[PDB]
Nucleic acid binder design. Structure first.
Lengths: 222, 222
DNA sequence: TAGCCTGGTCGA
DNA sequence: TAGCCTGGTCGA
């Protein structure tokens, strides 16, 4: 790939990796669902290489004790964890802008505590007492859900139908039922649908459909 | 310590480690808060040693690539994670029985979905339409909370004042306010109170106080 | 396969 | 220091 000069030394930020990765996308596959999965794959491959230049030398020369091993073990695991999550946020932000969805707030304050990944169409409209509450949207983003999905709930007391975007290779049917009852709606990249139980597949939204719904919903907003 | 014979080979269960660990407790420090922290420390030290006999040899001879390193790295990290959590559950179960708290359900079904770590005084009383709902208690257990605490919420729709037991070395004041509003009440081992902000320390329960409250609350139940 | 998190890194 | 989880192990 040939990386930027100081990357060998200083480990780049999430936006920096992607900023570099952008000049290496396949192009075009103008479907938003295709684009995400592709941009993720390209970004990840670059990340793998940067990671190697920081650890591979330490990896080979072994560890004298468990406490030594596990410190870097946790450090490296948790580097991936923190960066994987921010990556998906960023990739969706870029895709919203590129596909006509300009009406969204990134760091939007709702009730004063929890702040959702994405709020629609505005932080302002959300507090606007005369904006139709049923036209409000919220997008929580989780690369994997597992048990962690329930942490997304009351991020927007005002919105009961909440959207969760995830890359998980199938959510259990039992687990999906809990999500429905709690008012959660999955947005999942078209390609990953086949990993979800047949009964669930029907109620699954693609990224493309999400963007299209919201684009029309807020077309009448400046 | 000298471990049981087959431990070198087969990695023991959580109950097995503790069953062995019990014959190695300090004794007595009859305070429940003291006993937990001690039994945890004894259990952990044994765990560390069992872990070493399974990994130390693999740890020293290094790794050829990142993908090799990270597989065991995640495996070992996640062994600790799964076992740490079950350990605390077990230690509290044993302490409840030993200190007169016989009225609790371990695997209690509430609404049919989420099942709380501990339900009081009975799975039956919880569904008993004439048991005073304000005398119901529920105990979620988390070794560390972090962001994960919000996953404990609606485990018992019927109970609004919920108890969370944790070993975390201080919960932020901002984070504690969210817990209060969501109807969560911390139970924290006496010794760890000094790690919590001064403003929070006041509303913190000890294990001893928890057991004493519930013991009196259910003394009139067979 | 639901729950665990003997948890450090990243970027407001 | 709040949010992340490019997540596998354990035991119903």
């Amino acid at each position: 790939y040939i990386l930027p000069e100081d990357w060998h030394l200083r480990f780049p930020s999430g936006s920096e990796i992607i900023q570099y990765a952008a000049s290496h996308y396949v192009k075009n596959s103008l479907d938003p669902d295709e684009q995400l999965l592709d941009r993720r794959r390209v970004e990840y491959d670059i990340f793998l290489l940067v990671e190697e230049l920081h650890v591979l030398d330490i990896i080979r020369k072994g560890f004298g004790s468990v406490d030594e091993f596990i410190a870097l073990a946790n450090s490296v695991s948790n580097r991936r964890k923190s960066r994987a999550g921010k990556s998906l946020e960023l990739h969706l932000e870029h895709l919203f802008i590129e596909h006509g969805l300009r009406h969204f707030a990134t760091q939007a304050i709702t009730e004063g505590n929890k702040k959702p990944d994405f709020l629609f169409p505005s932080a302002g409209a959300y507090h606007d007492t005369e904006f139709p509450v049923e036209n409000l949207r919220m997008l929580a983003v989780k690369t994997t859900c597992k048990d962690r999905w329930r942490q997304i709930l009351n991020e927007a007391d005002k919105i009961h139908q909440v959207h969760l975007f995830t890359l998980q290779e199938g959510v259990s049917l039992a687990q999906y039922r809990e999500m429905r009852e709690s008012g959660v709606r999955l947005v999942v990249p078209s390609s990953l649908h086949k990993k979800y139980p047949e009964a669930v597949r029907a109620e699954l939204m693609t990224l493309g459909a999400f963007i299209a719904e919201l684009t029309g919903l807020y077309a009448d907003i400046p």
